Structures are given as structure tokens and as C-alpha cells.
Amino acid sequence: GLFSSDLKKNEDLKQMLESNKDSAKLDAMKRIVGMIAKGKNASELFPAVVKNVASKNIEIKKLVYVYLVRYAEEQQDLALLSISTFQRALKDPNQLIRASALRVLSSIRVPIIVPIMMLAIKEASADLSPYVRKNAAHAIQKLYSLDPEQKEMLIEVIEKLLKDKSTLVAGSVVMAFEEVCPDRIDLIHKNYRKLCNLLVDVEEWGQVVIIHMLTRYARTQFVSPWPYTMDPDHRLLIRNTKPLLQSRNAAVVMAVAQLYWHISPKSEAGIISKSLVRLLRSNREVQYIVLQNIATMSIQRKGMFEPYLKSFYVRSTDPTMIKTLKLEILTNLANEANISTLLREFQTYVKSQDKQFAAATIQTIGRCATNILEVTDTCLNGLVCLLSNRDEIVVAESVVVIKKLLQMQPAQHGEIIKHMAKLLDSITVPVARASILWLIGENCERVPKIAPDVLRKMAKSFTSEDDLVKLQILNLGAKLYLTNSKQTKLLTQYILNLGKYDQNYDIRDRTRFIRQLIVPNVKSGALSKYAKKIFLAQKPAPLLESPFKDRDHFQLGTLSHTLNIKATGYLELSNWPEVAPDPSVRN
Amino acid sequence: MIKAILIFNNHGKPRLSKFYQPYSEDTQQQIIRETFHLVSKRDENVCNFLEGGLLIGGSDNKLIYRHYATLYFVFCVDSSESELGILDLIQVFVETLDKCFENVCELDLIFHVDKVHNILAEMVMGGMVLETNMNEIVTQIDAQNKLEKSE
Amino acid sequence: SHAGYQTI
Amino acid sequence: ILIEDSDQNLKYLGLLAMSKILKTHPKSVQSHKDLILQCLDDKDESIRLRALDLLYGMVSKKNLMEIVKKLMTHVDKAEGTTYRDELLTKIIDICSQSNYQYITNFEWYISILVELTRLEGTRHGHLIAAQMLDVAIRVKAIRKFAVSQMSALLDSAHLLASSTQRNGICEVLYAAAWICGEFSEHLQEPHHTLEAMLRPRVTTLPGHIQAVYVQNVVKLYASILQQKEQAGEAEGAQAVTQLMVDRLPQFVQSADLEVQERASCILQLVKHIQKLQAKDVPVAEEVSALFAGELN
Amino acid sequence: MIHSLFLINCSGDIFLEKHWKSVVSQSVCDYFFEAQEKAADVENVPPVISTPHHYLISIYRDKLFFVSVIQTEVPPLFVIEFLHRVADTFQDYFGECSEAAIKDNVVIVYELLEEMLDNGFPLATESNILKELIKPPTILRSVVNSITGSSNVGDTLPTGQLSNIPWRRAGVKYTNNEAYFDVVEEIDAIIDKSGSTVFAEIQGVIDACIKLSGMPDLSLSFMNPRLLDDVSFHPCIRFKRWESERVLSFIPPDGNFRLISYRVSSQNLVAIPVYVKHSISFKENSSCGRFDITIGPKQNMGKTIEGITVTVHMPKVVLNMNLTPTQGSYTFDPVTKVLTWDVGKITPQKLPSLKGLVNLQSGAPKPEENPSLNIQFKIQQLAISGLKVNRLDMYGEKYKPFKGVKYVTKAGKFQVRT
């Protein structure tokens, strides 16, 4: 290969593949693998490459296998040429080679060789070397994905493999179970005892997989522990997993945490949060997932994170999404015994360079204000002070939160509204603009000397306003009309005329609705006589609930709650049985 | 006609830089960087006829390019030039480099760039195409080589 | 490489 | 010949030149329409874009629908979100040019538009929604059709609500609801329609979508209230009122100020309705008057 | 589990393409690119991204993105730890996971990936076994390979794979029998504006290099194990004996090896070795301000503080700075507004400082806070926790190996408010 036509170079590679020199073959294959790694279409070399599948140079053999994996699915006819080589390799005394052959054979995605692969799997289960058996487990999974109809036989094979005492095999076998027949719990019952006893002796990746499986069946064999005595088998499960908590593998730790969260007695499970905290000492990618799990847990068991509160403090180096998650955790952990500290910290957080974070912080303060009524006066005061901040986002956000606070506590805060009326001149963000107008309307009887001035200002700007704002203008006007048509009906009419021609039909719909409702007319009946009751109806306070409340049905630790979506392949957890199923099945 | 000819790798490092229209040294460097982002980010299946950059004096001009392996060849030309004709000229320029370097490679761009420039000078003079006959351009290149070897 | 370590 | 070649550089240029011809003698250019459609199968999007431009120029009443079927075929198999957004936009622009100049069968058009709502992930769902409203409003003749299709879209909201992004899939619901409310007289099962609108899932929709729903829902209620009060089914009307009683309390807790605002004033209206109906008052007349004020 | 893997450089380019279950279109990477574009920083790119048909799990590390493609439900940390481990493996074989290392060893890394991941499931995972399955790319070996035709791929499953001690090789001998221990502690601390300690804890980890012949059974014990808590353990450790004896008994793996990690309880006040005096003046809408920072020793335990670096992320109002350092080196990046001061080490005869004026954007308002301080430092021959090892014993072998251990404390997550 050199600075020339790729076609010609490929022909030269064919010459190398045909050449009797092993080094020529190696060179070609390395170049070919490089092309595979680069996503290049080396498929045209397939009939030339396959000829070297029988080469004695093990280095080449590996390179060939790569090639075949990459293109055999496409060149299904040509791929058939490699079959005998694998078949012979499977009979070789060297089990490393046998295993390699088994793997490669199974990876060939050609429907023609299914019968062959099936036979190979059966023989593989009978291999007697645990190394090959481990590979056999993977072969099962592979065949299943290629031919679902063989499932019954594959199940029989798994059933056999489940009896293997070797810890180097069982891990993969369990994985295969989940991949092929996750519902066949009847195949495991007898094996539970050793699965528990040997779990600590299983390689870390297997342990993760096994534990997830274990929790899923545990919820059918046992009944919620939270007088109830603990089943020796239940106890076995938990007492054996205990030591795993200190594992170096974060996934393992999480798996352990999962187990206790969904199985362990609520009075005992508290311990796992200690470990969950040390997970935050690892790589950020891990931390992201961990924080989601913590937050999910904290919405129910606040006491499990309580003593570690300061560990959730946000550092300026944290990514916005990390800052956000920590903030939510702190939110859930806020209470009257620590809110004074948190508020000081939050006050600092509000001034962060990360305005997105600061905005969220402001929202959080509002949320904790509704949680702790005892501090809302001071919460409000600080929040109000933020209105003087030169930043548009900061102020606009605080306006919205204040609105919410006023919904919660509709006390005499006309002075805030008065201030808001002045702020409105500078407010750019439509949401806040609308919010201000809404507050004015809600308490226009408390600021009746201001409202009509605001009204005509808005009336002039109406066509340039956001549709949301326009809707507030309409509602504001309606209230002003009903309570003071003698001064505002002209402007009201103008506004109605503006709505009348506005292209956003939602506005027009609201406009005709209001017009008919508040403007005296031919059919001004009883309901129109209640317009003042309708517009002056007292509204209920908002519920600022945490989003994790919607993840209760997802199993903690799974992809599905990290997405908040029932992800492909996700199995839902069973509910606790009224009574436990016949224990002797597990004997 | 030709405003500049640039050769650079997939990391923006230069292999050849020859300008015909006057630019400041910083402008030249910036043009290269601009060009790099404009060319190296294009897929292998993207039309070789690109719009011009702005640092060169305007997008009316064109960036005709060709690349392989990790090397990019860009011909900055003005709006009146034949993008197709240029591409043809680019390839035969390369053919000349092969004729003179017995298959030109990156190492010739790296360590023999002075001769690459000599060759290039025979191909293009002042941004105007000096030679289109590939055997004649080699002939004159070797005539100079012989002169050098002689004395 | 042994330099710098505390004998133990 | 240049277009038929493999060199994308000159292929593009050929198409560019073809455009120059199209601009003055499209009557001859139309002969290569199929070729231009075939050009969309290349990898270089500037060619594919040029082809779309040429297709725009070549579309007429004698080949619109046919070209559209192929345009759809392409966007269906096409990959790339922004590419698809462009394809969508172009399909729309092509068929909408000069007030849908080449569409005589709007029934067809809308069903196409419905297929376009299935383009999951598009950032121009609001564009589609605008088109939905434009035709349903303008083409009176097929409003019944549009209503039935939009009611289907409203039932499909449980899937459409999988993406509540601004200008995304959920914007379809904006339009669908508006039409079904305004043209509720073309509903066959307005009760069902309401039940679909009353689904708890609605609370996860974008604020302005929910706002649309509660406004159309009370219009839909006005229609069914009139239906039952006209029929004389007072107890049926009591059940209807009870549904309002049992649904508005959910919406009033919406985070969207205007949803909870409208919901609150609606519930207050409902309170009065329940009292007046308890007093044997035919309130549907007064209620329907709140919507009857505008047809366009 | 995993269907495919793409190695993507922060530039937005794809360098290494792998497929195990089927061929995944490169267009799936557009969803990542979109997310990358939406994020204001590579650190803030969501590790989990859902697409219409695929789930994208990814890790950002060393300017590389490890983007895996999964079509079914797989526990996120399972995947994350796995991918992370792969990157660690690359560091083991090529010094570090870098795009350069990858493009220069494509065939080798391609092969490594094929051994490590089997049809989406973990296969070769333990370092020492993998090291025997595929020999590291030693230039001396490559010479031998060109001479003899020797492979880098073995033909015998390493005996340790089927042993009861899977984390290590069998039959390995050294003439230079030795073992090195490295006790590293990191100080995690939050200091407020007043200089008060907001939060602090100690993160420790003990690594080791094992060059001991045969299968020695090590026994590590501490003089003050009571200070250890929430200790992680590598699986090779006989946890039961840790619990009943409070002794770390185990037969270690060869070479580079992480043994345990631990936390020092907050019940003990964490000594802070460095204090900071500071003042930054920002007059609203001024063309300039003032900067003054002094770094000094505090609870340094009589040891030298060295390798000191101060990093500050300034607000957009800052255009440049007129600062003069007392030592080390002052530099400032006006592009990203980053202030970096190489402090060096502290000599008590004169404490280091950086001071001068700040060039601000005229007409732009002063910031509501001063940027927090990120400060690095190291103290050798010092375990700030006071952790001390009691004994290191060995059983099963007869030689008397070099035994050595170091104690060192470095800055952990050390940040100061201002």
C-alpha cells in the first residue's frame, strides 16, 4: 500500500493474500484490519481473505477472524468456505483454540449454519473444560438472537449449565438466562443456595448481572419484611451480599444498593447510603448516575442521606447537570433543623457565574419555602432583594418564584406588586412580563390606582407582546372591566378589537369567550352575571413536588429510571406476594 | 486566477504554503486555519468545489480541494476559474510530483519542499498556470536538476 | 527505584 | 449525460445548469423529473438539495401528487434529523406554493400531512400544525374529514406526547384539538372525544397544549351539554357535569399559570353550572354562546 | 450487552469503529454531536442519551469520547465501569488512552477490544491475564517477532485463568524480589470567604508494585486501623480476615496494583496545610480593578508544601491582568479568562503571592462574586491522616524481598470561596 489508487492497492492485497509469504499475508491483513477499524469497505476482498482461514500462523488466524466477523453477514455464501476449519478446530485438544473456534463460529451470522451452531453448542456444554463452557454460555445467547425458535433447546442447555459448580462459568450462564429465558425461574430455584454462597467468588461483572437477577426473583419468593420473621433463605441472600458493599466496582456497589433498596428491611437498609456516598468519590460519569439514584431514594428516605448533608454541596467545577442533581438532593434533605445553613449556602449559590444553576437555585429556594413555612418571610425578603439585580434572567426567574409564593401566601404584599409594576418597564422575558400582569390582576383591587396606567401601556404594546402576555392582557382587562368599566371599557374594547384580528386563534378564542362573558349583550344571562365570580374566584396554592416521585415504579439502578422511560427490554418488578410460595421448591 | 495553494495535514499542520495574492503573515496563517476548518471537516463524499473563504478577500473565490490519507491539497482560486479544469490540473500536478519524486510522499513535502516549490513554480507562475504539459514540465524540472548537478 | 521508600 | 455520470462535482454543476434552463424553459425540463428524483439517492446533500429545488420548479397539478409520493418515499427512507426537517419543509413549500396552487384533493393532502405528523423527532411540528389549521379552516368542504383524522390524532396523543418539545411532535395536538373543538359538530363520539381529552396523560403536555385542551374541552362540553339538554337527557347532563367536577381539580394544579388559571375559572363556571342544573336551568344555551361568537 | 463502540475525539471526529452484534450506522453519532453542541462544555454532555432506536452510553476522558451503542436495557454503571476499564487497559498497554496511541496501534487495540468484549459481554477483563493473552507492544519484542516470526498472541490459556487466584499469573519469578507501597491521601476541602472550613474529609488510597517471585501471601497491618473507615477492598483481599483480625491478608497480582481505598472520618478535624489571603476589587463599569492573593502554610506539619498551582476562572468583565508574581509563574488566558499561577513551593522566609491590577471591560458591571480558587499542592513524606503501617509480612516464599513504603498527601478537591 502507498500513495495510489485504492482499487489497485486492493488488488495488490489480493496478491499478498495469494502469496505464499506469511509476512506478506500479515501485512495485508494488518492493512485490512486498519480499513475495518476506519469503516472502509473491504468486503470486496472477502473471497481472497477467506482462503487464509486455514493458515497455521495463529497471528494471521486472529486477523482473519476479525475480517469474517465484519463481513460474513453480507457475504453469506462465501463465508460457507470457512466452516470446516472451525469444525476441525472444535475437535482440537487445545481448549483455548476450541473456545476461540466456538466463539468465531457462533459469531457468523449466516442462517444456513444454524444446525451446525446448535450442535456445536450442545457439544460445548459437554466440553468438560470450564473455559469452553463459559464461552458456550455466550454461544447460547448468540444463537438465540440469531434463531429464537431454538429457545427450547437452548433452555435445556442452560438448565444443564446451571448445575456447574465452577464460579468461572456460572456468571456467564446467569447472563445467558436473562438473555434467553428470564422468565424461567423454575430453572433456578434449586440453584439459589449456591448462587448465594458462591456470589462473592464470582468475577465482578458476573456479580453485577447475578444480583440484578437475584432481586427480581427475590420479590416473588419472599414477602416484604417491612411478627414477620426472616426466612433463612432471605437472610442468606442478604447476609451474603453484605461484604460486597465494600467492592471496588461501582456497578457492584450499586447492585448491592439496589438489592437492599428493594429487598432489605427498611430498618436495616439505611447502611447502604454510607457506601453510596463513597461512590461520589469516583469518576464523574459514575457520580452522575449515582446522584440520580440518590435523589430517587431521598424523596422517600430522607434520613438515609441526612448525616452526610455537606457532602452534597456543589462545587464551582461541577458541570451544570451535576450542580442540578446535587441541588435537588439538597432540596429533599432540607428541613427546619438545617435550613438556616442551607439558605446561606443557597444565597451564595444564587450569585454563581453559572446563571443556569443560579436560576435553578432560585427555584429551589422557592420550593423549600413551600416546604418550610416558618422561613418564608425571609425567603421572600431575599428573593425580593434579587429583583434589584441587574441580570435579566435572575430577576425574571425570581419574579416567577415570587408569584408562586404569593399563591401560597396571598397576604398584603401590594408593595411588592408596586415594585413589580416598576420592574415591568425593564422586564424583557415574556414569562415574567405576563406573571407581573397576572399578579396585578389578582390584586388589582389592592392597587387600583396603578393598574389602569399599566393597562394602557400594555394596550399600546399589545401587538408586539408575546401571545402569553396578550392573554394576560385580556384577563387583566377583563378584571379591570368588570370592576371598573367606567374608566377602562374603552381600552377593553380596543383590546378586544386587537384580539379579534390577532392571528393566534387561541387568543381569539379566549377573546370571544371573555367578550361574551363580560360584555353585556342580548343573551347576558345568569352565567354572565357570575363573570365577576369567575374572574375573582380564589385560586388554590401550587404543589412544587420533586420529579423523582414519578420514578417509583422503576427499579432503582436500571437504565429506565435514568431515562424515566420504560427502556427496551426493561422488566418490571413484581409486587410482594401475599404469602410466600412453597419454600421446599428452593430446597 | 490562483490566489494561493496550500497543503496541510489532518491536524492543520502545513506541508506547503504558497501565496500569490499579498496577505500579511498573520492573515496567511489565519487563511490556512480558516481553510483547514472549511476543508478538513468536509466528508470524503463532499463536492470538491467549495466556496471561498473570507480572509482571502471573499467567498466569490473558490476552494478546490483534494485529499487522501491525512493530506489535504487546496487551491484557492478566484470566481472566474474553472473548478473542473482546476481539479484536472490538481491531479496532473500530483502526477508530476510522482514523476519527479518517483512517487511523491509526505516525507518529500516535509524534507524536499524546496523542490516541491520548484516544481510548483514550473506548474504555476504568479497564480497563473505556467504549464499544462506534464512531460514538458518534467523536462524543464530535470533540465534545472541537470544544471545544478553540472555546476 | 528503591530510593525514597521507607524501609518496611 | 453529466448528471448520469458518477462524478458528483459535475453532477451538481449539471443540475445547476439545469436550473438555469428550468427558469426559462421548464416545459422541457419536466422530462427529466424522474432523473431528478433519482438524484436524491446520492450522498452529497447539496446535490440532493439542488434536486429538491428542481423538483419545486417542475411541480404542477399534473405531477404534484406523484412527486409528493416520491418525496415522501424519500423522507421515509431518509436519515438525518436536519435533513428530514429540510425535506419536510421542502415538501410543504412545494405543495403549499401559491396557496396550495396545485392541490385539488385536500382530503389527500391532509392524509399526507397526517403521514407527515408521523415524522418522529422533527423540529417543525408547529409548521405542520400551522398547515393543518390553514387547510382545515380554509377548505370547509372537507372539515368533517379533517375532524375525523384529527380525532384519531388526538387518540394517538398518548404516543405523540412522547415528545413535548417546543415546535415538535406535540404541536400536532395543538391543531388537532383546536379543530375538533371548533368543528365538534362533525364528531361521531364527542363523549369519547372528551374522555380522550380528560386522560391524566394530558397533564404531561406542554403548557400551551394543555391550555388549548381546556379551552376546546369546555367548548366540547358546550356541544355535548347542548346535545343532552336538547335531547332532554338531564341526567346525562348531570353525568357530564360530574365529569367536569371530577376533572378540573386535576388541571388546576398545573405548573402552567394559564392552564391552572383557565382551569380555575372553568371549575368556577362548573360550580355554577351544577347549581343551575340542580335548579333545572338549561345553561347550555348560555354556555354555547361563549364559543358561538367566532367561526373564523 | 453492547452492540457497538465509537471512539470520538473532542474535535467531532470518529477514529475507531467497532461492531460486535451488528453494524451500527455512523449517523447515530449525530445525536451525540447534537448534545455536544447543546452543552456548553464536554464535561456537561449527558452520559446517557436516548435516540429513536439506540441508547448511547458514553464516557468523556482525556479528550476522547467513548460512545457505546446499546439497543436494550443494561445497568448504566455496568457499562460505564466497563468502558472506563477499557480506557484503563489502553493506558496500561500504551501509557495512556490518546487518539495518537490509538491511530499508531490500530491493529493492536482492535485486537485488545476483541479479547475484552465478546458479543457485548465482558470476556477478558483481568489485566494480568490479558497481558499474557496479548503481549504488550515492546519494541524489543517486535524485533524478535520480525526475526523469529513470533506472535503477540499466546496459544495457551494462562493457568491463572483457571486457578483460584484469577487476578494473577502463575510461575512468575524475579531475581530482584521487591514490593513497593504508596499511601496517597487527598484533602477534600471547602473553604469559605472568611477562611473558615466549611467542609473537609480525607480520601486515601494505597497502591503497590509487586515484583515478588512465586505466590507470596502478604499480610498488611496498621498501627492505627481505627482511623480507617469505609474502606474499599480489591477482591484479592481476604475480607473475612480483615473483619476478624483487621488484617489485609492476600496473595497480590503482579506489577502495578491498587490495593485499597479509604476515608478518614469527619469526627477528626482535617488539617488544612494551606491558607489563602485574598482581595479582588471590581468597581462596576470600571476599566480596571485590583488583584491580590497570598498563599501560605498553615497545618503543614513541619513539612514542605510543593508543586503548588492556583487556577481561577474569571468573569467576562475581565479582559487581561497586570500581575507580578513573587515566584513561579503568572499567566492569563484572555480567551477563556483563565488565571493560572504556578506557585511552586513555600519557603517560610517569604510567602508567595501574586499581585497587581486587573484590566476590565469599561462599561461592563462588576461580578456578584469572586471566582472560587482551585489550588493544587503536595507534601511528601506525610500522611496527613496520621495513618501508619504496622507490619508487612509474607508467607509461602523463602526469599527476603525489598520492602518499601511511601507516605504522601496531595490536594484533593480543594476549593476556596471569595
DSSP code per residue over B84-136: HHHHHHHHHHHHHHHHHHTS--HHHHHH-HHHHHHHHHHHEETTEE----HHH
Q: Report how far apart, in Å, the C-alpha atoms of A188 and of each of A157, A585, A587 are.
A: 13, 10, 11
Of chain C residues 1-8, which have a CB less than 8 A from chain E?
1-2, 4-8
Task: Report yes or no: A444 and A451 within 8 Å, Cβ to Cβ.
Answer: yes
Of E72, E78, E166, the CB nearest to A203: E166
What angle in degrees, to the nearest 10, is found between the helix axes of D234-245 and D207-231?
160
Residues 6+ away with beta carbon under 8 Å from A243: A200, E239, E240
Cα–Cα dist E345/E411, whole Å: 14
Alpha-carbon gap: E75 to the closest alpha carbon of chain A (Å): 5
Nearest CA-CA partner of A556 in A206, A269, A242, A328:
A269
CA distance linking residue B108 with residue B110, whole number of Å? 5
D270: nearest Cα among D284, D280, D289, D291: D284
Return the percent helix, strand and coil in chain B, to nearest 5: 45, 25, 30
Q: What is the DSSP letter of A126?
A: T
DSSP assignment of E325-385, as one string?
ESSSEEEEETTTTEEEEEEE--BTTB--EEEEEEEE-TTPPPPSSPPPEEEEEEEET--TT
- Give one DSSP letter per residue of A41-61, joined into a string: --GGGHHHHGGGGG-S-HHHH
Do the chains contact at D269 and A527, CB–CB below 8 Å?
yes
Nearest 5°: phi and psi at E237? -80, 135
CB A399 within 8 A of CB A435: yes
Q: Which residues pair with E261 in a beta bridge?
A: E205, E232
Comparing alpha-carbon positions, the chain A residue that sits nearest to E13 is: A38
Task: Name residues whose C-beta falls within 8 Å of residue A421's C-beta, 6 or more positions apart in sequence.
Answer: A436, A440, A447, A450, A454
Q: List the single residue in D with minimal CA-CA distance to A432.
A: D257
Residue B111: φ, ψ to 5°: -110, -10
Measured distance CA(B39)–CA(B55) in Å, rounded = 15
- Mark whether A and E touch (3+ CB pairs within 8 Å): yes
**H helix or E strand, kind and range, residue E305:** none
- Cβ count near B102 (within 10 Å): 9
Count Cβ atoms below 10 Å from residue B108 Cβ, excluding itself: 18
Residue A136 and residue A175 in contact, taking contact as beta carbons nearer than 8 Å: no
Give the nearest chain A residue to D208 (CA atoms). A468
Give the Cα separation of D76 and D84 in Å (integer).
9
Rounded distance between C-alpha atoms, residue A143 and residue A149, angstroms: 10
Cα gap D251→D211, rounded to integer Å:
10
Each residue of D266-291: b (16+ CB within 10 Å) or e? bbbbbbbbbebbeeebbbbbbbbbbb
State the CB neighbour count (10 A cutoff) for residue D80. 12
Helical residues (DSSP H) of E124-264, grouped into ranges: 127-133, 139-148, 239-244
Burial category of A189 from C-beta neighbours within 10 Å (exposed 0-12, middle 13-18, buried 19 and up): middle
Give residue D210's identity as a one-letter amino acid code.
Q
Q: If you write DSSP's letter for every residue of A283-298 in order, what string do you get?
A: -HHHHHHHHHHHHHHH
Nearest Cβ partner for D253 among A505, A506, A543: A543
Q: Are E223 and E404 contacting, i.e. CB atoms less than 8 angstroms apart?
A: no
At B15 the three-state DSSP class reads strand
Strand C6-7 to strand B71-77: parallel, antiparallel, or no bridges (unpaired)? unpaired
**Other Cβ atoms closer than 10 A to E138:** 11
Q: Identify all chain C residues contacting E404, using CB atoms and an 8 Å cutoff.
A: 2, 5-8
- Whether A539 sits inside 8 A of D261 (CB atoms) is yes
Distance from CA of B60 to the nearest CA of A (A): 33
Measured distance CA(E170)–CA(E160) in Å, rounded: 6
Q: Helices A339-350 & A355-371, crossing angle to 10 degrees?
A: 150
D212 vs A: CB within 8 A: yes
B147 touches chain A (CB under 8 A): no
Q: What's the burial of B93, exposed, middle or buried (CB within 10 Å: 0-12/13-18/19+)?
A: buried
Contact A537 D265 (CB under 8 A): yes
Residue numbers in C near E407 (CB within 8 A): 6
Which member of D258, D268, D286 has the closest CB to residue A468?
Answer: D258
Give the closest of A438, A516, A533 to D268, CB-based.
Answer: A533
Q: How close does chain B come to D64, measured CA to CA in Å?
A: 30
- Could you give the residue ranges of the DSSP H alpha helices within chain D? 8-22, 26-29, 33-39, 45-58, 64-77, 81-100, 106-116, 125-138, 143-155, 157-160, 171-182, 190-197, 207-231, 234-245, 248-251, 257-278, 284-292
Residue type, A33: V
Task: Determine, for residues E166 and A278 on separate chains, whether the beta-carbon distance falls below 8 Å.
Answer: no
Q: Are D100 and D146 in contact (CB under 8 A)?
A: no
Task: Find out whether E181 and E392 touch, Cβ atoms under 8 Å.
Answer: yes
Interchain contact A37–E (C-beta under 8 A)? yes
Per residue in A266-297, is it b (16+ CB within 10 Å) or e — as a string? eeebbebbebbbbbbbbebbbbbbbbbbbbbb
Residues 533-552 of A with CB under 8 A from E: none
In the three-class reduction of DSSP (H, G, I as helix; E, B as strand; rest coil), residue E275 is classed as strand
At E91, the amino acid letter reads: Q
Please tell me what resolution, in angstroms, this structure has: 4.5
C-alpha–C-alpha distance, residues E303 and E380, integer Å: 8
Q: Angle A514-D134-D155 (CA atoms, 0-180°, nearest 5)?
A: 80
Q: Is E34 on the interface with D (CB under 8 A)?
A: yes
DSSP state at residue A315: P
Of E306, E299, E291, the residue nearest E271 (C-alpha): E299
Residue A37's SS3 state is helix
Distance (Å, whole) CA E93 – CA E111? 12
> Hey, is the C-beta of A308 within 8 angstroms of any chain E C-beta?
no
Q: Flag if E407 and C6 touch (Cβ within 8 Å).
A: yes
Q: What are phi and psi of A410, to 5 degrees?
A: -80, 55
Q: Distance from first CA to last CA of chain D, Å, rounded?
A: 53
- Could you tell me which of A289, A299, A301, A307 has the C-alpha nearest to residue A264? A301
Name the grid cell of E409.
498527601
Whether D9 and B45 lie within 8 Å, measured CB to CB: no
Q: What residues of chain E lie within 8 A of the CB of D121, using their CB? A: 52
Q: Smallest Cα–Cα separation from A86: which of A64, A524, E222?
A: A64
Tracing cell 508567595 back to the chain, one arrives at E352
CA A257 to chain centre: 17
**How far is Cα A431 from Cα A403, in angstroms, rounded to an integer?**
11
Where residue D99 falls (left for φ over 0; alpha for ψ -120 to 50; beta otherwise) is left
Contact residues on chain A for E374, CB-CB shorter than 8 A: 317
The sign of the torsion formed by the CA atoms of A468, A471, A476, A479 equals negative
Query: Coil, helix or strand for E218?
Result: strand
A with B: how many residue pairs have Cβ under 8 Å apart?
A: 9
Assess contact for A363 and A327: CB atoms under 8 A.
no
D241 interfaces chain A, CB cutoff of 8 Å = no
CA A441 to chain centroid:
41
Q: How far is CA D106 from CA D56, D111, D177, D184, D256, in A?
A: 19, 8, 19, 20, 36
> Cβ contact (<8 Å) for E181 and C2?
no
Q: Hey, how many other C-beta atoms are within 10 angstroms of the C-beta on A42?
A: 20
Interchain contact, E34 vs D121, CB within 8 Å: no
What are D272's three cell numbers? 355554577
Residues on E contacting C at a C-beta cutoff of 8 Å: 178, 180-181, 389, 392, 402-407
The grid coordinates listed for E188 are 477534600
The candidate with the shortest Cα–Cα distance to E188, out of D177, A281, D254, is A281
Tell me whether residues D10 and B47 touch, CB distance under 8 A. no
What residue type is assigned to position A226 of the chain? W
Residue of chain A whose Cα is closest to the Cα of B95: A4
Distance from CA of A321 to the nearest CA of B (A): 29
Q: Per the CB < 8 Å rule, is A539 touching D276?
A: no
